[PDB]
Enzyme design. Structure first.
Site, PDB file in Angstrom:
ATOM      1  N   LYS A  49       8.621   9.224   6.244  1.00 46.84           N
ATOM      2  CA  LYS A  49       7.214   9.267   6.600  1.00 46.84           C
ATOM      3  C   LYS A  49       7.133   9.220   8.121  1.00 46.84           C
ATOM      4  CE  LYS A  49       2.872   6.561   6.206  1.00 46.84           C
ATOM      5  NZ  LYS A  49       2.052   5.724   5.280  1.00 46.84           N
ATOM      6  N   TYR A 103      12.559   7.682  -2.226  1.00 47.78           N
ATOM      7  CA  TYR A 103      12.054   8.991  -2.615  1.00 47.78           C
ATOM      8  C   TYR A 103      11.515   8.873  -4.022  1.00 47.78           C
ATOM      9  CZ  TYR A 103      12.707  13.807  -4.536  1.00 47.78           C
ATOM     10  OH  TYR A 103      12.586  15.025  -5.176  1.00 47.78           O
ATOM     11  N   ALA A 104      10.257   9.272  -4.220  1.00 47.15           N
ATOM     12  CA  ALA A 104       9.703   9.386  -5.565  1.00 47.15           C
ATOM     13  C   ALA A 104       9.729  10.845  -6.037  1.00 47.15           C
ATOM     14  CB  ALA A 104       8.299   8.841  -5.591  1.00 47.15           C
ATOM     15  N   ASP A 124      -5.845  -0.236  -0.689  1.00 52.33           N
ATOM     16  CA  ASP A 124      -5.923   1.223  -0.599  1.00 52.33           C
ATOM     17  C   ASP A 124      -5.355   1.855  -1.871  1.00 52.33           C
ATOM     18  OD1 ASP A 124      -5.001   3.748   1.945  1.00 52.33           O
ATOM     19  OD2 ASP A 124      -6.781   3.538   0.652  1.00 52.33           O
ATOM     20  N   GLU A 141      -3.531   9.242  -4.750  1.00 50.02           N
ATOM     21  CA  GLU A 141      -2.608   9.813  -3.779  1.00 50.02           C
ATOM     22  C   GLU A 141      -1.562   8.791  -3.291  1.00 50.02           C
ATOM     23  OE1 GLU A 141      -5.096   9.483   0.454  1.00 50.02           O
ATOM     24  OE2 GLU A 141      -5.921  10.760  -1.166  1.00 50.02           O
ATOM     25  N   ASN A 142      -1.786   7.492  -3.507  1.00 50.71           N
ATOM     26  CA  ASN A 142      -0.845   6.468  -3.069  1.00 50.71           C
ATOM     27  C   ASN A 142      -0.130   5.845  -4.260  1.00 50.71           C
ATOM     28  OD1 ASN A 142      -1.680   6.686  -0.271  1.00 50.71           O
ATOM     29  ND2 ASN A 142      -3.204   5.089  -0.588  1.00 50.71           N
ATOM     30  N   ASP A 194       2.100   3.172   0.325  1.00 50.39           N
ATOM     31  CA  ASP A 194       1.151   3.282   1.423  1.00 50.39           C
ATOM     32  C   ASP A 194       0.450   1.942   1.641  1.00 50.39           C
ATOM     33  OD1 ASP A 194      -1.586   5.520   2.459  1.00 50.39           O
ATOM     34  OD2 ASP A 194      -0.359   4.032   3.533  1.00 50.39           O
TER      35      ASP A 194
HETATM   36  N1  ADP Z   1       8.247   8.248  -0.881  1.00 54.46           N
HETATM   37  C1  ADP Z   1       7.592   9.371  -1.169  1.00 54.46           C
HETATM   38  N2  ADP Z   1       8.139  10.254  -2.052  1.00 54.46           N
HETATM   39  C2  ADP Z   1       7.451  11.375  -2.329  1.00 54.46           C
HETATM   40  N3  ADP Z   1       6.278  11.784  -1.829  1.00 54.46           N
HETATM   41  C3  ADP Z   1       5.751  10.880  -0.982  1.00 54.46           C
HETATM   42  C4  ADP Z   1       6.359   9.701  -0.581  1.00 54.46           C
HETATM   43  N4  ADP Z   1       5.558   9.016   0.321  1.00 54.46           N
HETATM   44  C5  ADP Z   1       4.510   9.771   0.463  1.00 54.46           C
HETATM   45  N5  ADP Z   1       4.559  10.927  -0.290  1.00 54.46           N
HETATM   46  C6  ADP Z   1       3.528  11.962  -0.263  1.00 54.46           C
HETATM   47  O1  ADP Z   1       2.975  12.003   1.041  1.00 54.46           O
HETATM   48  C7  ADP Z   1       1.577  11.614   1.009  1.00 54.46           C
HETATM   49  C8  ADP Z   1       1.193  10.848   2.261  1.00 54.46           C
HETATM   50  O2  ADP Z   1       1.955   9.628   2.355  1.00 54.46           O
HETATM   51  P1  ADP Z   1       1.274   8.200   2.705  1.00 54.46           P
HETATM   52  O3  ADP Z   1       2.407   7.226   2.915  1.00 54.46           O
HETATM   53  O4  ADP Z   1       0.288   7.874   1.664  1.00 54.46           O
HETATM   54  O5  ADP Z   1       0.540   8.567   4.088  1.00 54.46           O
HETATM   55  P2  ADP Z   1      -0.890   8.113   4.673  1.00 54.46           P
HETATM   56  O6  ADP Z   1      -0.652   6.732   5.193  1.00 54.46           O
HETATM   57  O7  ADP Z   1      -1.231   9.100   5.723  1.00 54.46           O
HETATM   58  O8  ADP Z   1      -1.948   8.139   3.519  1.00 54.46           O
HETATM   59  C9  ADP Z   1       1.430  10.893  -0.337  1.00 54.46           C
HETATM   60  O9  ADP Z   1       0.094  10.970  -0.830  1.00 54.46           O
HETATM   61  C10 ADP Z   1       2.355  11.744  -1.204  1.00 54.46           C
HETATM   62  O10 ADP Z   1       1.764  12.998  -1.481  1.00 54.46           O
HETATM   63 MG    MG Z   2      -2.086   4.909   4.782  1.00 53.84          MG
HETATM   64 MG    MG Z   3      -1.762   7.419   1.645  1.00 56.65          MG
END
Ligand code: ADP
Ligand code: MG
Ligand code: MG
Ligand code: ADP
Ligand code: MG
Ligand code: MG
Ligand code: MG
Ligand code: MG
Lengths: 265, 265
Positions: free
Chosen positions: A37, A87-88, A131, A135-136, A149
């Site tokens: 990230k 990693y998810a 939060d 999406e999280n 997140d």
């Molecule tokens: N560990 C992960 N494995 C797979 N996809 C991820 C992972 N972390 C984040 N994502 C993808 O990236 C997006 C943004 O990551 P996030 O950490 O939520 O950022 P933000 O803080 O900007 O909301 C997530 O909604 C998902 O689509």
């Molecule tokens: Mg965030």
């Molecule tokens: Mg997020």
């Protein structure tokens, strides 16, 4: 160690948030797959949220639970900060909901169980997420839900103020015992999710931001015909205007609708 | 404008906190007397509280009330930040209490009235102070109390998150209407003060930090014989373990003990 960018092979984008640009990555010595990230320092500074990122790292990195995404470490260069995440592989619940439109009762109940297990671990350690949204919520290799997140999370016992260790003499019990923040906020979110999972839309959805604000503050939702009695009971209990009337997580995990439909303990 | 150090003649130290070194100052063109609160950037960064200083300035600078210290502006150089404050010529309530040991009922009730007027202005605008204590209560030229040191204050409607303006869909009513934080914290403080003003010691005082923590969490205080019935009633109502049982400020301002003894409306 002090990881740096050149320790990783970079692959495709996994997702984008307002702040995180997340990439598939492979550590070179191990060939271990994880997610990076990436945040822009200029953007963090402009929005005034550098503190939140610090807290995201301090709080998430210490959590250990199968339904919570691991954060392994971080590093930074002149323009970016990089968070090293688990990693998810199966994506977001947000994307699964786009794919299926709505989830059946068994899938919903299973997700709610996993979310409630994760949040009970958090809340028992005075971690509040603040939060929770599709999406999280990420999906691991057996389709199990993982909260992620921790941008807005709080943990009073490790807060800046607690660490300063000022006098207690003028502070109320709620504050000195790191109980300053209300965890019931996450319980509302869980109710919003359970509705959205079954219905395909969140309960307080409206065209404008203003209309949405009204719908939430008045708790104006209705159920479609197909939402069953057990599901209505759980959602109705979670979506209380008064935070203190929202149930304990143990009542969510033991709810008859949950126990009848959930595949996970 | 963009004030700088060379616009001011500096005089004696007025006080020192953990962070602020506060100096008497005179603006050169006007000859107007005020106070400069000076902070070290390295110390702000080391303690992790740069965000709090930003909030102290954003929140305090907009308040307008005779019982709240004005903040007029700020400026910074390579090593320091300077806050331009209204000068309080009669010092702190902390120092008056060192001088007198304890206050009579009329002085106490007057201070509590002024504090409650200031806090009702704040709370009605969703400002919560969170650091009410004698060293942060200053005295103006007619001996009127002025709340100061908004270091820990919060104002959800102007918070970083609110300004980001994310989706409301998953957030409970308490959060979307900038009601996220509990103002009852300040009411407890007011009770601690009223006791300390009359008795000369705070109610939960003990040798160690650990013993103090216990005393507060159990609400273990007793009254000396000389504390009158009316004063016991007000203090007892403010020092409730459960924040929601603590009274509204209007009940403090209209309390019979307050109205019988206070010289100020
Ligand atoms: N560990 C992960 N494995 C797979 N996809 C991820 C992972 N972390 C984040 N994502 C993808 O990236 C997006 C943004 O990551 P996030 O950490 O939520 O950022 P933000 O803080 O900007 O909301 C997530 O909604 C998902 O689509
Ligand atoms: Mg965030
Ligand atoms: Mg997020
Ligand atoms: N405007 C002022 N006029 C007079 N004395 C002041 C003023 N502001 C602060 N002081 C004195 O300086 C001390 C420290 O200031 P404060 O703003 O509370 O700093 P800190 O944030 O470190 O607690 C106060 O307790 C008081 O003794
Ligand atoms: Mg964020
Ligand atoms: Mg102070
Ligand atoms: Mg301060
Ligand atoms: Mg401070």
């Amino acid at each position: 160690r002090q990881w740096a960018l050149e320790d990783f092979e970079i692959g495709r984008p996994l997702g984008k948030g307002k702040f995180g640009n997340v990439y598939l990555a492979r550590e070179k010595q191990s060939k271990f797959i994880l997610a990076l990230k990436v945040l822009f320092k200029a953007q963090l500074e402009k929005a005034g949220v550098e503190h939140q990122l610090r807290r995201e790292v301090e709080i998430q990195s210490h959590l250990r639970h199968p339904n919570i995404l691991r954060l392994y470490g971080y590093f930074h260069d002149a323009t970016r900060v990089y968070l090293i995440l688990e990693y998810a592989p199966l994506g977001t619940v947000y994307r699964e909901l786009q794919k299926l439109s709505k989830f059946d009762e068994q899938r919903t109940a299973t997700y709610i169980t996993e979310l409630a297990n994760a949040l009970s671990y958090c809340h028992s350690k005075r971690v509040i997420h603040r939060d929770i949204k599709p999406e999280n919520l990420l999906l691991g290799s057996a389709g199990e839900l993982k909260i992620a997140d921790f941008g807005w999370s709080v943990h009073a016992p490790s807060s800046r103020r607690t660490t300063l260790a000022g006098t207690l003499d003028y502070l109320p019990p709620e504050m000195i015992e790191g109980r300053m923040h209300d965890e019931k906020v996450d319980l509302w979110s869980l109710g919003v999710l359970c509705y959205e999972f079954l219905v395909g839309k969140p309960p307080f959805e409206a065209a404008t931001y203003a209309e949405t604000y009204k719908r939430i503050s008045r708790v104006e939702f209705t159920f479609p015909d197909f939402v069953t009695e057990g599901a209505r009971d759980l959602i109705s209990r979670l979506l209380k205007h008064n935070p203190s009337q929202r149930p304990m997580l143990r009542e969510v995990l033991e709810h008859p609708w949950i126990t009848a439909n959930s595949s996970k303990p």
